[PDB]
Amino acid sequence: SRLVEVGNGYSQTSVNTTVFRNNSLVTQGDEQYISYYDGDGYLVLGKRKLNSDQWTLQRTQYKGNVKDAHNIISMMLDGDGYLHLSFDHHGHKLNYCRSTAPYTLELGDKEPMTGVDEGNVTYPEFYPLNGGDLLFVYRSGSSGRGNLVMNRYSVKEKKWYRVQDVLIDGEDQRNAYWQLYVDEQGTIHLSWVWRETWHVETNHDLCYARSYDNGVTWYKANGKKYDLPIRYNNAEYACRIPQNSELINQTSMSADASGNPYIATYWRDPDSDVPQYRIVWHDGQMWQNRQVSDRHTPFSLKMIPIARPRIVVDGGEIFYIFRDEERGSRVSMAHAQAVGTGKWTITDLTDFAVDAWEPSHDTELWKQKRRLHLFVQHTKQVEFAPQPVYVLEV
Numbered sequence: 311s312r313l314v315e316v317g318n319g320y321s322q323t324s325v326n327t328t329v330f331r332n333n334s335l336v337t338q339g340d341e342q343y344i345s346y347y348d349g350d351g352y353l354v355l356g357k358r359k360l361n362s363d364q365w366t367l368q369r370t371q372y373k374g375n376v377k378d379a380h381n382i383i384s385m386m387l388d389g390d391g392y393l394h395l396s397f398d399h400h401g402h403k404l405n406y407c408r409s410t411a412p413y414t415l416e417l418g419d420k421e422p423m424t425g426v427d428e429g430n431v432t433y434p435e436f437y438p439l440n441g442g443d444l445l446f447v448y449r450s451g452s453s454g455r456g457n458l459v460m461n462r463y464s465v466k467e468k469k470w471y472r473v474q475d476v477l478i479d480g481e482d483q484r485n486a487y488w489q490l491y492v493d494e495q496g497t498i499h500l501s502w503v504w505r506e507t508w509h510v511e512t513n514h515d516l517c518y519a520r521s522y523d524n525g526v527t528w529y530k531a532n533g534k535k536y537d538l539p540i541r542y543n544n545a546e547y548a549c550r551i552p553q554n555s556e557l558i559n560q561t562s563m564s565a566d567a568s569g570n571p572y573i574a575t576y577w578r579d580p581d582s583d584v585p586q587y588r589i590v591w592h593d594g595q596m597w598q599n600r601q602v603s604d605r606h607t608p609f610s611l612k613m614i615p616i617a618r619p620r621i622v623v624d625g626g627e628i629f630y631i632f633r634d635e636e637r638g639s640r641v642s643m644a645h646a647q648a649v650g651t652g653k654w655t656i657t658d659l660t661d662f663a664v665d666a667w668e669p670s671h672d673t674e675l676w677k678q679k680r681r682l683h684l685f686v687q688h689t690k691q692v693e694f695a696p697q698p699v700y701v702l703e704v
Contacts, residue, residue, distance in 0.1 A: 311659055312703040313686070314363050316356055318696040319346040323379040324666040324689045326699065329618035330489070330560050331382050332435035334685040335701060337675040338387045341413065342683070342701070345385045345395065349696030351376040353383060353397055355415040360675075368415035372405075374398035379666075379691060384434045389442010389465040393417070396434035401451045404428035423461050423470035427452055433560070438674065439524050440496035441465070445473070447490055455480055458488055460525050473525035478502060479539035487513075487559035491571070494677050497522050499571045501548060503559050510611045513557040516573055516590055517545040531571065531592040548597045549590045551577050556585040556611050561618045566625060570594055572649070574619040574630060576603075583608040587619060587632060591649055602630050602644045602654055613691045617668035620684075622676045623649070629682055629704065631659075631669040639663040641686055641702060659684075659702055666691035672701075 319326045326334070326346040335344050337360060344356040344365070353372040356365045374397055375381045383397040391412030398405050406423060410416045422428055423446065430451040437445040444463040449456040460474040477500075478486045488502035498521040506512040519528045519540055528536040530546040537544065551557045556578040563573045572591040578584060587603035609615050615635035622629050630644040641659040646652040665688055672683040682704040688697040
């Protein structure tokens with residue numbers, strides 16, 4: 311396990327180190343690309359050969375509102391190697407731009423994608439699709455409720471298209487908070503929690519959908535097609551988790567090479583005061599859930615002392631990345647040989663605290679090479695000097 315220093319990043323908020331940076335770190339071919347805000351709030355882009363520890367860094371023209379930890383950067387490369395960057399939103403007009411050439415750390419001007427409903431964006435996320443295309447998802451707040459908007463980028467036409475405007479429907483009654491993953495077959499996996507009111511304690515349930523055709527048609531894990539949009543009544547429930555369970559929103563999910571989904575989150579049992587990390591997965595036959603952690607320290611959502619988790623999986627083997635005040639807020643990993651049946655082995659991957667850090671990882675490196683690389687930086691959530699950004703090669 312190797313810590314590869316990149317450069318100093320902003321540390322006074324967790325903006326560089328949230329679970330919903332999709333991506334902070336991404337590989338294509340033999341190169342890995344990184345993005346973060348530096349100490350002065352500028353968007354920095356970096357790249358290296360995966361062999362090397364030598365990064366080439368470029369400070370861009372863009373500064374972000376780093377004082378707000380929502381205002382993350384998400385990056386991805388398309389099939390032709392152009393970087394796509396979206397950044398600095400908390401209910402703001404879309405900030406999106408492309409590199410001026412493939413594999414180059416130079417960004418063009420801000421541009422629209424479709425120009426439709428791009429005035430109130432939070433949580434930009436990119437995902438690669440088959441054939442070098444991209445998926446972009448964001449939370450549109452323009453209606454007064456967060457709504458999932460999903461676009462596709464045609465790498466051959468260099469154009470974005472709307473895929474779904476109305477995918478998850480709260481029916482003016484509830485909210486949803488989602489995460490996604492595109493698997494090795496190019497299948498889009500989607501999971502989410504509902505929230506009945508504005509308050510976090512009214513988070514409940516975990517639902518799921520997938521799309522094999524770049525987001526046009528959607529299916530349940532049980533194989534039934536969805537009639538869109540997906541509402542409380544017709545959603546597939548991966549797990550029923552009631553309100554007031556300290557169920558967290560906006561975590562992460564993955565899938566194995568068989569296209570089976572895994573969702574990492576945490577919640578608290580009715581009979582306990584202690585939230586525990588969980589894994590919820592569908593093995594082709596049924597949904598299951600299992601407690602990952604063995605925590606003893608209560609907390610309530612109503613800095614959160616545990617991070618929202620990331621996972622990678624290789625044929626039922628799970629690496630479950632987290633951070634917990636019980637473990638000195640280090641980067642920690644829970645590992646099972648078999649998700650459902652193997653003992654969990656919990657280890658620390660750093661010997662130092664990263665405090666407000668939450669994991670994000672090189673999703674494409676995992677899919678392509680089965681190497682787990684994490685974006686690691688000690689952040690707080692505060693007078694605190696810029697702290698080195700690392701890639702932690704697990």
